[model samples]
Target: LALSLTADQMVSALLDAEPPILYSEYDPTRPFSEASMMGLLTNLADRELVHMINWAKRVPGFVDLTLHDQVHLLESAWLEILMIGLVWRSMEHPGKLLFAPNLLLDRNQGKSVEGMVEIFDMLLATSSRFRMMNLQGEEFVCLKSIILLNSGVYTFSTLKSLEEKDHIHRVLDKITDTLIHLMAKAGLTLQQQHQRLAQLLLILSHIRHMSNKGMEHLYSM
Candidate 1:
């Protein structure tokens, strides 16, 4: 079946698919220790991972792909999505990373875990950039969808079938078109639209870099 969704409908679908805000169970009263902090973060991440998978299933046109492709995309993009969400949540809180509504950690707190300070610093920098851009909710949604759709582009022959690859590319193109329409609807001038789109896409590379660092941090734990 052809995807005949309007840009507005696509936006609504993405909004509907957004995971509910989660609260971390970390007790700030507990003495700052590497094990406890790591446990808190890992637990929060695991819970969010479930919501991420659910969100992907509900995204517009996501279910139309073969099951294998759907799973592969999620596998490749989960960390990036999480990083995006983290940056979005932290944008308002300068010099602090908000892992959850109740779980805000400052640079001093991040020092408890080895190499955590570096990761936290990078995330905070990205958050600052997002704050500077004044990234809106609709724009964030489209950016996330683009990230997931393009997740496999850098991989080495993961999706073996050429036809499957073409189908995924077509889906990505449609999402990009919708994003362009969204920018226009928001009253951006052509120059502003082009600039904003480029800037937004450029942020994805930073996100990928942060996610890779996060993965390494996870492995080290």
Candidate 2:
């Protein structure tokens, strides 16, 4: 009996040299291929979408969004992926990573999750109408979904070891750095960055529900 499998020759002759295969036409409703859409979406303006800057201006750039308000999927195919990154980072690096800053923005500046919580409490105390008007460096309320905003209670419950925590910090660094690089290259900040960040919080809020696979690869199911 002869036992043979396609290996070296197959890879060299038919696999490695082949250009990328296309899926169905650019009919997004029927994705041509998962990777096809992933590469397309991740590149923002490359596919049917207009441009990277435009997509960021518009959130959840779903098909229904007006041509002007359409945004391609950015970080975390869904918030759940971000949540995985968050829960891991928080538990793994108690004193190292923070959800809002470390995971989402430059760690050099901190968001102080506890401070946000205090603000939330103060809002309730004042009948949900507390205002910090006239305060310097004040921006938007920065309010987020009840769950997406990071619930300190559950993070502790699902904690992992210190080594795992450090890994989370690395992941945060990689993800945040990639985001910063993409947006900066596209000339994102300083103008419409505020709006982009707002929509991102929405993206982050829903991240907890997504599967890691979905977020890992923007178009994959």
Candidate 3:
């Protein structure tokens, strides 16, 4: 009910709040091995984690949530959000993932890291699908917002109050509406818009699957 920002304004805010692209501070002098590669990847991820939190704080209505809910949502979906960004960034390239501008890895290259093969395959496949769709930048932001807002489902026990649940539901609806409006503004026909919307929303399930795999892989390290 307190949502005051227009869809366009929310788009601009998310874009503005996006973390600047970062480069891995990997030392090239070191031999490329599993330990080194994983180290660099984890280091970059850790740095980006800080920016991810900052980006969430900037999302309209995100700060308005109860502090507990805000933390809960971020913890629940950070990997999914990160996976989405990674998929988006690497969609332009075939068969490789851009962990950072300097830290790109093809499946073969990623094989050096234990347990990375399956994750890499999943990410590359998702990226290929997104590339085929020609995903737009604005649409990507909207999708990220939807993912963040809806992440609470993974931790239903923490979502205690009806008021908080309703508040998130409203925010989620607004973001989805914005995505619909965006497609219309892009000149998509009614049918085409719905088709694309459905396709995008369906990818959320794949993202959740990838996030779970990523968590397992990380924990194994």
Candidate with maximal TM-score: 3
Each prediction's TM-score versus the true structure: 0.92, 0.25, 0.93
| Residue-by-residue lDDT tens digits, candidate 3, 1-221 | 22777878777887787877788886678666454777787888888889999999888788887898899999999999988999999988898998888788899987887898998999999999999999999999988888998977446424357777877888888888788888999999999999999999999889999999999989999
Q: Say which prediction, candidate 1 or candidate 2, comes out ahead on lDDT.
A: 1
Which run of 10 residues does model 3 get worst, by summed lDDT? 153-162
Tens digits of lDDT, candidate 1, 1-221: 22677778888888889997788875568554554788888889889999898898887777777887788888898899998999999988999999988888999899888999998999999999999988889889988988887886456245366767676677677777777888898899989888988998999999999889989988999
Clashing residue pair totals per candidate (backbone < 3 A): 0, 8, 0
Q: State model 1's lDDT.
A: 0.84
Clashing residue pairs found in predicted model 3: none
Residue 60 lDDT in model 1?
A: 72
Best model number under lDDT: 3
Residue 175, candidate 1: Cα error in Å is 1.9
